[PDB]
Amino acid sequence: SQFDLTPPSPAQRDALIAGLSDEEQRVLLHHGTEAPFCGVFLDNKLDGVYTCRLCGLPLFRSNAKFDSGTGWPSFFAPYDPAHVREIRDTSYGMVRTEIVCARCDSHLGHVFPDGPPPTGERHSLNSVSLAFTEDGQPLPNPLQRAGAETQPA
Numbered sequence: 229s230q231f232d233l234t235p236p237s238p239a240q241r242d243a244l245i246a247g248l249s250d251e252e253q254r255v256l257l258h259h260g261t262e263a264p265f266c267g268v269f270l271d272n273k274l275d276g277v278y279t280c281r282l283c284g285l286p287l288f289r290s291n292a293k294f295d296s297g298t299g300w301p302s303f304f305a306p307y308d309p310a311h312v313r314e315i316r317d318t319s320y321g322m323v324r325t326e327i328v329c330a331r332c333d334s335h336l337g338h339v340f341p342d343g344p345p346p347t348g349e350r351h352s353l354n355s356v357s358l359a360f361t362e363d364g365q366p367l368p369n370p371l372q373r374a375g376a377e378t379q380p381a
């Protein structure tokens with residue numbers, strides 16, 4: 229990865245958390261799920277990068293976005309394999325794989341093996357877990373880190 233994946237320290241973490249909605253906290257920090265069909269990014273024409281709403285880490289490119297019919301924004305591949313981490317989720321007596329932001333450990337959604345080609349993979353996202361940066365615009369980079377994060381998306 230061209231990005232510094234070092235977790236923010238408790239101070240940087242709380243600084244960013246403080247800027248977060250009630251609802252954003254519910255999803256990102258407490259494993260919550262958006263009401264399906266309601267998220268701002270469910271339909272989004274634009275070319276660019278979907279970043280972690282907490283720490284700004286690029287998570288998904290628009291060129292990997294597709295319509296799954298589930299009511300959540302969906303991607304067949306992450307920005308970079310190392311940017312999205314998989315965690316076992318046994319909640320609701322189901323067996324699922326939660327996806328978290330590899331840097332800040334925030335909740336994003338789940339990944340499923342029922343996606344389309346090329347990958348056969350479906351990353352199912354909460355729109356509220358994401359911020360969007362259009363192609364060529366500067367990334368939010370709230371942790372002010374070097375490398376690709378100072379570059380336009």
Ligand SMILES: CNC(=O)[C@H](CC[S@@](C)=O)NC(C)=O
Nearest residue numbers: 261300336337338352353354
């Ligand atoms: C089987 N599908 C599920 O569990 C989906 C995955 C959505 S992502 C945004 O967490 N969620 C439900 C049923 O709440």
Ligand SMILES: [Zn+2]
Nearest residue numbers: 280283329332
């Ligand atoms: Zn993050």
